[PDB]
């Protein structure tokens, strides 16, 4: 569409903790934000699934690496 409009529902549910803070956030975030946004999982499927986002790239989980898990294509 243009850039990245598709983060918005995202960074919204995941600011919560990189609100202010850098985008990346810790497994521990995701676990709690995955399991509720768009998505809703479990800690494990979320932590055992960061794996594909989060991984040394840059930071932890940010909103570019963190999409992919509400909709790793």
């Given at each position: 569409m243009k850039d990245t409009d598709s983060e918005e529902e995202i960074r919204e549910a995941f600011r919560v903790f990189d609100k202010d803070g850098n985008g990346?956030?810790?497994?521990?975030?995701?676990?709690?934000?995955?399991?509720?946004?768009?998505?809703?999982?479990?800690?494990?499927?979320?932590?055992?699934?960061?794996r594909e986002a989060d991984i040394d790239g840059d930071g932890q989980v940010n909103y570019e690496e963190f999409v992919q898990m509400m909709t790793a294509k």
């Open positions: 990346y956030i810790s497994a521990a975030e995701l676990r709690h934000v995955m399991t509720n946004l768009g998505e809703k999982l479990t800690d494990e499927e979320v932590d055992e699934m960061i």
